[PDB]
């Protein structure tokens, strides 16, 4: 049960890794702003800082308190 | 000629460029704009080669700075002295010091940590100090609290003296150049006056207050049942009576039959089998010899008349065929540069306090030391570190003065140039010896742990199957142990218990014994010497290719510390001399981590322990679990880690905290160590967005730190971590154990 | 009592692990006098966790087999069982402290920025200044629902910004 | 200004040797050269490491790569006003003015130059790397 | 050789020129900016990309820089 | 027990897409390197100079991303 | 372009200052493509406060 | 004695005050409230 279940959860958490990899390079190479452009797409890079910004804000918010609370007990 | 030369009112005392930060350098002076203006402002305060160019005032600077750290050290001196005055039972632990153990820092009655209150014992709580301050003063002669603190009162008015001697040689009366120049003077004064009226001094206090009441406190006497050193003092009747000697005051002396005074100047070698120290006539005898010797060689130089030496004259008096010119010039970069002498004076200094540790811990020489297991321990390894952390310093302002201040005019054919032509040469031999001892040392524990775990121990290496032998440490030892016979005549005994014989033993407790040596210590002192000569090889290489190199050929011009030269002609990432000393400190912290382990096992197992025969505190398993790296885990540390991590509820918690805290830090100095500043940047760049939006951007900029901040702040953070990691565990085990 | 607990002044866990500690507390503290400041302090001691665990059971706190406390949130529940007093109160509270600090921060920023130097004013701070700003950061919530209302605290799109968007 | 010539036959100055001496690159695939005239005769610092003396008047070394010629030409050019001039040295001994050749060092600007590797544009105008795409080797938009 | 590019913000301050330890470059005459000179790189087999140029050029948005390419005997700078 | 641990899981899953979507979207343009899609997706670094350039690359942002992956499972 | 001393408002897109605003030192009257000179008091990721523009890259505001 | 007061005036003093003043008042706190942990 437990090699199983462990081997398992290694091997999807790499794949997820290397999928956003992959995503990335996506942009790098594949990206086109004229027919993407207006849409969906071109909304996201519109509102990537509030994006990264809240997500490091959730981050270090539950790193704080958790940690703080693991060290008090 | 040599006189004294001074200047006056050289720079006011004024608050004004106090309110002006950054004044130092007209660079920094101009105001912050961006982060990194902090960091630069704090890394060069004390820069004084870059701050400007005068040798009167860089030296000036350092001088009043010598004084700031002397009235430091007196503060805090008497910050100890008070403290054991106060808040200790050290009258306590003199009544009996065999079962009171010392303790002077007390906890306050709050939130939970009372529960550190340690008894140790005299009807007294708190914590258990390790410094040995009760046997130091024990071994001196202090009895009334009233000691400590008027010692403390005066220690703290010495610092006040010295931060006023500071201010004064500093903004009064500044001497000038060649009144620090004068070397052969300062030698001549140095070594006569400091050491030799100190050695006197020393051995005058010794006879006629230590050594009396010493005697009298091992004959057992009550503690303050024993005469006032002035009472000593004054009644030559009472010396009479210890030391027939004494009523017949100097003239035997100064006749010249020195025999008659040797009732308290002894040579008995050995220890005193009260106390498990050395004797106070013996070290009487040594402090006298020392004193007449440093005291006839303070007369040496010429200073102002004609007897005595010139040391350039003599300097270039030693010229050999196979190195041209010699020692010329060496007067003069001596004579010019700071940061030769400091190179210097920290090498010798960091193996001076690595002897001190080793002959220490070899022949204890205070009362009752030798029981505090503890206290050895931490003394040694204490000692052992900031030996190494002197050494790497001196290896790393070596190369800085090599790039800065270094002119190859004055030195066309030198010794110094000779060498930096074959460079090259020398650091291949070196590579190459290393790598040797590397391979065979490493390789043979390996080797051993396979023929183990493979299940053929028949063929590992131990003193079982095929040995090894410290053939020549036996042999020496075997000498030492029978020297007094033949070589030294009028010695009673060898001069450690470690060459051989009886086993001196205190309240149960072992002192001393003679020590075993096996393949295991052979082949952990080879480890030890691979280790050493591949730091010796980093700091060499960082040196010796400070100026420019085969690569860069441009380096001096660059500065002593700078990043890289961009991923130019392949990646330049680290290639700075101070990037060296980095990878340097690196190493020494691995090397000195490996040797206190080997002390700290080798004396659990085999020396320590209590009297019924013996009975070690591991009971001897090293020279079996200590040629195997498994064992070496398991039976060693994993063994010994138990005290530690279940030191809760106990007044020991504090140890076991302290050990999570150091793995934590520790590993938190690796995101520092790996990470790059060009996404650090990038994400304050978000995070300037974010904060701008609500209209707060602090109008100091944001910027990630410098590269050099980088991996300055990784390994500081690093070896924090690791070395309080160990104290930590060290501290705890022997506690408990102890 | 609820979802499987129950009052920690009932709880046997609670009272036999206090057994533990004054067994402990006791066996310890018969090796000293009476009146060594040592007794007295192991005394107090024992006294303080007296009154603690009196506290605690007087609270109402719930602790299941463990016996240590255990803690609820949601308000509904929380309130609908009187149990307020341990996470809705205090973030709350926290809330309140935590604006109020920031939003002075804010307005000390704002000032500052609209003189001649604002890198000496954020490297040097005008004591006069903190000093009204602090008293005046009591209102901090009214006032910034106000700028909200007046649509005063977001600013337009006039940020700095990379190249795409 | 007319080009010199590498004169082989010129006093090498005073060193008694180091290290950074003789490879099998001459032998190989190429080496280095380098010539200038002294006003007086002075010691100095060896790019490579020693301490060397120049020759009053004229002066011939020998460097493997080109940093160290250069290095060499910026020193004499800095703290006496001299001016060097160097030669690359090919494996047929292929004699290559490497210095000089403009007659006039390039830190200040002379008519004959042709404006080069120059994009009349800037650099956000550039194109995105979807269409450089599909080449044999792969090419930065940059260029284009 | 590794890439150089200049641009037409090329001002002409030479500190391309002034800094390049490889001699990959040089100034021309010309006309786009007060200066009338515009750095020329006529030599980019020499350019061992350490950047010292891209550290100089002080055009807000640069002007001129390097790519790094594939390497040789000639190119990488190596002793051996 | 199971919060505490519950609550850390969140934090290292939420840490870990933030450094990986940041290292997929800034990997077009930044602030710092306008022009960092005429690189491609690897390239060690951009010198020293403008206060240097360490590991920037969007394949970099992937390389540290994995150690925070590793932490969580 | 506008008198000296005025206050335009930068759009270069890559420019370090892009959408903000800094004040213009002078505007050459001849014909160089960027005859704009604009103070700042921002300094950017090299230490530099001003920056030279052409006419349209700049709004004076 | 104006500039003195400025280089009171300086951050890190002014950080290390405040900061004084915070613990001080927990610490007097946690004396005279020993182990709240409700209302
Ligand atoms: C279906 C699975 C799959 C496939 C077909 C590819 C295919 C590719 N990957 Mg890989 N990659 C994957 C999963 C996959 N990857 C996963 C799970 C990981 C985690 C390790 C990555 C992370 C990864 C990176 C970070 C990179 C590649 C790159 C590449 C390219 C070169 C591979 C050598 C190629 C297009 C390289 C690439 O495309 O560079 C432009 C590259 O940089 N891959
Ligand atoms: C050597 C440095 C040093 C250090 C680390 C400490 C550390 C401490 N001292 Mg201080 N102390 C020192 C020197 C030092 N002291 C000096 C030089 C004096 C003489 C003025 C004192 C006199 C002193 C007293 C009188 C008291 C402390 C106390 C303390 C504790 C709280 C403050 C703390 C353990 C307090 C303490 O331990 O109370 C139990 C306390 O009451 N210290
Ligand atoms: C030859 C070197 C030498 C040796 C072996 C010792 C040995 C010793 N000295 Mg030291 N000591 C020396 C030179 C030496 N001292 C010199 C040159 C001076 C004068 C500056 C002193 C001044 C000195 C003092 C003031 C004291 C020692 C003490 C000690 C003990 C500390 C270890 C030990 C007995 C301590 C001691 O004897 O305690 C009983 C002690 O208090 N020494
Ligand atoms: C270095 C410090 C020092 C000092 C300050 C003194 C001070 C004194 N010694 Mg001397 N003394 C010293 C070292 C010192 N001694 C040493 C190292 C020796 C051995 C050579 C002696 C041996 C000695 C004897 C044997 C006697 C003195 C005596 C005295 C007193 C009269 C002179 C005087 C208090 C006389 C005295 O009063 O003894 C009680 C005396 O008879 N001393
Ligand atoms: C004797 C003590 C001593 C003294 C007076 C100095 C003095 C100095 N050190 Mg330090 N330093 C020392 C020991 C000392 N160091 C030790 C033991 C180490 C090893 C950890 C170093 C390693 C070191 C480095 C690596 C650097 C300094 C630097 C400096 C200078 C600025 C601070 C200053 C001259 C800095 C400097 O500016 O050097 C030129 C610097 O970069 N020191
Ligand atoms: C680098 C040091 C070193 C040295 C001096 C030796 C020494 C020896 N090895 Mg080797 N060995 C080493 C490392 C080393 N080994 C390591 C790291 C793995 C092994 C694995 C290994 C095996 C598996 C065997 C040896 C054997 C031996 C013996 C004869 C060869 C001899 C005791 C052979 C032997 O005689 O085994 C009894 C043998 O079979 N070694
Ligand atoms: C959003 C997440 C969330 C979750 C998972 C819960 C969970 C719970 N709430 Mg709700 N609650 C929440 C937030 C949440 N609440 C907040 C922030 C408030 C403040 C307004 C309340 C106010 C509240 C009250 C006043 C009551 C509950 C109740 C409950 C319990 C039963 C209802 C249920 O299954 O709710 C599942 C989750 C939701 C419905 C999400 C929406 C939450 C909104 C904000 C309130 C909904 C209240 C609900 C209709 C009450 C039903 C009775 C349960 C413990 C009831 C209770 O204690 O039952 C024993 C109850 O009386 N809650
Ligand atoms: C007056 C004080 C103040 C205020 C009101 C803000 C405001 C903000 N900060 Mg904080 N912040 C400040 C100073 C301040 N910060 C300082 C001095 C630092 C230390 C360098 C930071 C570092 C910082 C970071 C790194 C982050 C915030 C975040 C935030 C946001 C929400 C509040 C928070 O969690 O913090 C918001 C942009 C977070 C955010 O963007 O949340 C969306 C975030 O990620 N701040
Ligand atoms: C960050 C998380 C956190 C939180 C929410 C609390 C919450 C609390 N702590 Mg603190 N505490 C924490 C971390 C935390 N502590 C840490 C990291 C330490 C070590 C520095 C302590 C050490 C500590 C002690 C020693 C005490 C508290 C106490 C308290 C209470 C203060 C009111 C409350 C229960 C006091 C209390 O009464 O708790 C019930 C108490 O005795 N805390
Ligand atoms: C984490 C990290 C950073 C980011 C960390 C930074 C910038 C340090 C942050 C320091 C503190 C936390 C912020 C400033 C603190 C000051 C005292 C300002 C006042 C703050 C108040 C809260 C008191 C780097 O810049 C970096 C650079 C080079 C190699 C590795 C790394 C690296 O690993
Ligand atoms: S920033 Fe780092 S990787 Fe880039 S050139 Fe400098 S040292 Fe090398
Ligand atoms: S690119 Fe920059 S350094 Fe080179 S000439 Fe133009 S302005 Fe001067």
């Not at chain 3, 506290?55 to 240590?68: E, F, I, Q, T």
């Amino acid at each position: 049960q437990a090699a199983l279940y462990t081997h398992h959860q290694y091997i999807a958490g790499f794949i997820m890794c290397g999928a956003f990899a992959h995503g990335a390079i996506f942009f790098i190479r594949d990206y086109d702003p004229e027919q993407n452009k207006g849409n969906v797409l071109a909304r996201m890079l519109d509102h990537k800082e509030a994006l990264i910004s809240h997500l490091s804000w959730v981050s270090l918010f539950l790193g704080f308190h958790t940690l703080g609370l693991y060290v008090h007990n | 000629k040599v006189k004294i030369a001074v200047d006056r009112n050289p720079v006011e005392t004024s608050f004004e460029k106090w309110a002006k930060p950054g004044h130092f350098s007209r660079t920094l002076s101009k105001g912050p704009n961006t982060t990194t203006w902090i960091w630069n402002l704090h890394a060069d305060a004390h820069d004084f080669d870059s701050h400007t160019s005068d040798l009167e005032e860089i030296s000036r600077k350092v001088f009043s700075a010598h004084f700031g750290q002397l009235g430091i050290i007196f503060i805090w001196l008497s910050g100890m002295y008070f403290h054991g005055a106060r808040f200790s039972n050290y009258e306590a632990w003199l009544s009996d010091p065999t079962h009171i153990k010392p303790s002077a820092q007390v906890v306050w009655p709050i939130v939970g940590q009372e529960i550190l209150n340690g008894d140790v014992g005299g009807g007294f709580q708190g914590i258990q100090i390790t410094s040995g301050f009760f046997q130091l003063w024990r071994a001196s002669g202090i009895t009334s609290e009233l000691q400590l603190y008027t010692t403390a009162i005066g220690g703290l008015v010495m610092a006040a003296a010295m931060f006023f001697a500071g201010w004064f040689h500093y903004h009064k009366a500044a001497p000038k150049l060649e009144w620090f120049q004068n070397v052969e003077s300062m030698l001549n004064h140095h070594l006569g006056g400091l050491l030799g009226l100190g050695s006197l001094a020393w051995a005058g206090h010794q006879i006629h207050v230590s050594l009396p009441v010493n005697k009298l406190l091992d004959a057992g006497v009550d503690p303050k049942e024993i005469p006032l050193p002035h009472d000593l003092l004054l009644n030559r009747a009472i010396m009479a009576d210890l030391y027939p000697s004494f009523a017949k005051g100097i003239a035997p002396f100064f006749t010249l039959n020195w025999s008659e005074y040797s009732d308290f100047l002894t040579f008995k070698g050995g220890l005193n089998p009260v106390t498990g120290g050395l004797w106070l006539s013996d070290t009487a005898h040594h402090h006298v010899a020392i004193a007449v010797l440093f005291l006839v060689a303070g007369h040496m130089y010429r200073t102002n008349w004609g007897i005595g030496h010139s040391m350039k004259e003599i300097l270039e008096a030693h010229r050999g065929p196979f190195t041209g010119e010699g020692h010329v010039g060496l007067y003069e970069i001596l004579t010019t540069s700071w940061h030769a002498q400091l190179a210097i004076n920290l090498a010798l200094f960091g193996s001076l306090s690595i002897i001190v540790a080793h002959h220490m811990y070899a022949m204890p020489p205070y009362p009752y030391l030798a029981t505090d297991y503890g206290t050895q321990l931490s003394l040694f390894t204490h000692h052992t570190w900031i030996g190494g952390f002197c050494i790497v310093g001196a290896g790393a302002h070596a190369a800085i003065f090599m790039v800065r201040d270094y002119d190859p005019t004055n030195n066309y054919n030198n010794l110094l140039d000779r060498v930096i032509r074959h460079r090259d040469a020398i650091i291949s031999h070196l590579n190459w010896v290393c790598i040797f001892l590397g391979f065979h040392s490493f390789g043979l524990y390996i080797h051993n742990d396979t023929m183990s775990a493979l299940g053929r121990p028949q063929d590992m290496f131990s003193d079982t199957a095929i040995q090894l032998q410290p053939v020549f440490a036996q042999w020496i030892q075997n000498t030492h142990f029978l020297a007094p016979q033949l070589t030294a005549p009028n010695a009673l005994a060898a001069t450690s218990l470690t060459w051989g014989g009886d086993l001196v033993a205190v309240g149960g407790k072992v002192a001393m014994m003679p020590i075993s040596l096996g393949t295991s210590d052979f082949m952990v002192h080879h480890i030890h010497a691979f280790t050493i000569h591949v730091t010796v090889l980093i700091l060499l290489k960082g040196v010796l290719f400070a100026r420019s190199s085969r690569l860069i050929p441009d380096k001096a011009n660059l500065g002593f510390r700078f990043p890289c030269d961009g991923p130019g002609r392949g990646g330049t990432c680290q290639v700075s001399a101070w990037d060296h000393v980095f990878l340097g400190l690196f190493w020494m912290y691995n090397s000195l981590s490996i040797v206190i382990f080997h002390f700290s096992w080798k004396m659990q197992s085999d020396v320590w322990g209590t009297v019924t025969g013996v009975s070690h505190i591991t009971g001897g398993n090293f020279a079996q679990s200590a040629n195997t790296i498994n064992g070496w885990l398991r039976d060693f540390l994993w063994a010994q880690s138990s005290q530690v991590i279940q030191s809760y509820g106990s007044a020991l918690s504090a140890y076991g905290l302290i050990f999570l805290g150091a793995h934590f830090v520790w590993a938190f100095s690796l995101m520092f160590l790996f990470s790059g500043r060009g996404y650090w940047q990038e994400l304050i760049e978000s995070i300037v967005w974010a904060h701008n939006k609500l209209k707060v951007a602090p109008a100091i900029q944001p910027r990630a730190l410098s590269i050099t901040q980088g991996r300055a702040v990784g390994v500081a953070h690093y070896l924090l971590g690791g070395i309080a990691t160990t104290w930590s565990f060290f501290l705890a085990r022997i506690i408990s154990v102890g | 009592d609820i979802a499987g607990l129950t009052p920690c002044s009932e709880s046997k866990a609670y009272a036999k692990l206090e057994k533990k500690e004054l067994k402990t507390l006791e066996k310890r503290l018969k090796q000293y006098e009476a009146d060594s400041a040592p007794a007295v302090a192991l005394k107090a001691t024992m006294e303080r966790t007296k009154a603690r665990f009196a506290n605690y059971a007087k609270a109402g706190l719930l602790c299941g087999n463990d016996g240590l406390p255990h803690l609820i949130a949601d308000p509904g529940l929380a309130l609908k069982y009187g149990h307020a007093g341990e996470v809705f109160i205090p973030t709350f509270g926290f809330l309140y402290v935590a604006g109020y600090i920031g939003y002075v921060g804010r307005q000390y920023l704002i000032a500052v920025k609209g003189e001649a130097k604002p890198t000496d004013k954020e490297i040097i701070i005008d004591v006069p200044l903190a000093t009204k700003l602090a008293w005046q950061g009591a209102g901090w919530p009214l006032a910034a629902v106000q700028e909200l209302q007046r649509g005063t605290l977001l600013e337009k799109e006039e940020n700095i910004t990379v190249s795409p968007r | 200004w007319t080009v010199p010539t590498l004169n082989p036959d010129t006093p090498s100055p005073i060193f008694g040797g180091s290290t950074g001496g003789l490879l099998r690159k001459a032998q190989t695939e190429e080496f280095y050269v380098i010539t200038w005239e002294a006003k007086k005769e002075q010691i100095f610092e060896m790019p490579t490491g020693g301490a060397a003396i120049m020759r009053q008047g004229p002066n011939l070394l020998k460097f493997g790569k080109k940093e160290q010629c250069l290095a060499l030409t910026t020193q004499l050019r800095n703290k006496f006003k001299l001016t060097p001039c160097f030669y690359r040295v090919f494996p047929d001994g292929k004699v290559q003015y490497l210095h000089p050749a403009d007659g006039v060092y390039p830190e200040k600007v002379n008519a004959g130059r042709v404006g080069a590797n120059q994009n009349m544009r800037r650099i956000g105008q550039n194109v995105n790397p979807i269409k450089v795409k599909f080449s044999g080797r792969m090419m930065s938009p940059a260029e284009i | 050789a590794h890439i150089v590019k200049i641009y037409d913000t090329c001002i002409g301050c030479t500190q391309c020129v002034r800094a390049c330890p490889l001699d990959v470059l040089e100034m021309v005459p010309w006309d786009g900016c007060k200066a009338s000179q515009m750095a020329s790189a006529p030599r980019t087999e020499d350019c061992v990309g350490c950047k010292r140029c891209e550290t100089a050029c002080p055009t807000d948005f640069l002007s001129v820089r390097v790519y790094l390419g594939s390497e040789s005997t000639r190119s990488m700078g190596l002793s051996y | 027990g199971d919060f505490l641990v519950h609550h850390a899981i969140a934090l290292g899953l939420h840490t870990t897409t933030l450094i990986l979507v940041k290292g997929a979207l800034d990997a077009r343009g930044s602030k710092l390197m306008p022009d960092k899609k005429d690189f491609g997706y690897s390239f060690p670094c951009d010198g020293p100079g403008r206060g240097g350039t360490c590991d920037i690359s969007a394949y970099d942002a992937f390389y540290l991303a994995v150690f925070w992956m590793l932490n969580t499972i | 372009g506008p008198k000296r001393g005025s206050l335009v408002k930068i759009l270069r897109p890559e420019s370090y200052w892009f959408n903000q605003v800094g004040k213009v030192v002078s505007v050459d009257q001849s014909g160089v493509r960027y005859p704009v000179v604009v103070r700042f008091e921002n300094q950017n990721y090299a230490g530099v406060t001003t920056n030279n523009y052409a006419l349209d890259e700049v709004v004076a505001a | 004695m104006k500039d003195f007061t400025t280089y009171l005036s300086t951050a890190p003093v002014i950080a290390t005050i405040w900061f004084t003043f915070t613990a001080g008042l927990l610490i007097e706190i946690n004396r005279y409230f020993p182990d709240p942990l409700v209302f």
